[PDB]
Amino acid sequence: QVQLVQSGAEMKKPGASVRVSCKASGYTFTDYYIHWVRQAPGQGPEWMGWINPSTGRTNSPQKFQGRVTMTRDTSISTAYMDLNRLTSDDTAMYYCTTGGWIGLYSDTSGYPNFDYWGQGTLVTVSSALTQPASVSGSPGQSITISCTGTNYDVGSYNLVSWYQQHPGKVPKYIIYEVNKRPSGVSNRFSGSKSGNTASLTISGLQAEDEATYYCCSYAGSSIIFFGGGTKLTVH
């Protein structure tokens, strides 16, 4: 019963600071990376950072590099995210997810493998990878969503993961490492890759498949990219 329980919704004024909590249970806290992600209203997702619970090493991208302070408390097994200098642009839903396994012989920090998600923390203050805007299909058909990157990411790594999101719901693990399927994932989803473009394939399209689909990839110096998103419509 792996479960991540985040802090309560908050609303802050411009210029303030905010702390979001995340208490994980049902597994060993110090063996899995913790990632922080957020979602602006109407917009898509934006990767905020990763943190090693065991060592305390954290890295966030170069747009949060001054404002975000990610910490952890091992005694109580709780991750913390602190954001400073808030603006109307920081109004978003904040998720913490579980990353790759903290290994001796590897480095799974930048693995976009978010199998477990929190419930989300709504905070209100008052392009990266290219996906097509919308893709249409009729029931029974087979459709494909494309995800174009560069040579330094999806060109040189088989480290792309696909996530599904219904409106008002938490993102869902669909594909990881380009082609592989997690537990419970319908066999209708398959992953593919060519050059600087990965692709998610849905065969026997159905009404349950109506949602927005995002693609995640490695991004170079221990950083992760998110896609813009693609809306599937079922006729």
Short mmCIF file of N, CA, C and O in Angstrom, two decimals, residues 7 20 43 105 127 140 153 186 201:
data_model
loop_
_atom_site.label_atom_id
_atom_site.label_comp_id
_atom_site.label_asym_id
_atom_site.label_seq_id
_atom_site.Cartn_x
_atom_site.Cartn_y
_atom_site.Cartn_z
N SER A 7 0.80 17.90 2.08
CA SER A 7 0.25 18.92 2.97
C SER A 7 -1.04 19.51 2.39
O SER A 7 -1.40 19.24 1.24
N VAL A 20 5.54 22.86 1.22
CA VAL A 20 4.67 21.73 1.00
C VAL A 20 5.32 20.48 1.58
O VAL A 20 6.51 20.23 1.37
N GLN A 43 -2.70 24.61 -18.21
CA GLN A 43 -1.43 24.29 -18.83
C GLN A 43 -1.12 22.82 -18.64
O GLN A 43 -1.98 22.03 -18.26
N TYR A 105 25.38 0.70 -7.97
CA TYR A 105 26.00 0.58 -9.29
C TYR A 105 25.30 1.34 -10.42
O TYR A 105 25.54 1.04 -11.59
N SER A 127 8.57 25.60 -23.58
CA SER A 127 7.70 24.62 -24.24
C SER A 127 8.29 23.20 -24.17
O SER A 127 7.55 22.22 -24.10
N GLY A 140 -12.40 1.42 -31.62
CA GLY A 140 -11.89 0.28 -32.36
C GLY A 140 -10.62 0.57 -33.14
O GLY A 140 -9.79 -0.32 -33.31
N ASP A 153 18.60 14.24 -25.86
CA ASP A 153 17.64 13.64 -24.94
C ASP A 153 17.03 12.37 -25.54
O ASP A 153 17.60 11.29 -25.40
N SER A 186 -3.22 -1.57 -19.46
CA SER A 186 -3.82 -2.35 -20.54
C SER A 186 -2.77 -2.63 -21.62
O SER A 186 -1.96 -1.76 -21.94
N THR A 201 1.51 4.24 -28.80
CA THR A 201 0.52 3.65 -29.69
C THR A 201 -0.63 2.99 -28.92
O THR A 201 -0.41 2.12 -28.07
#
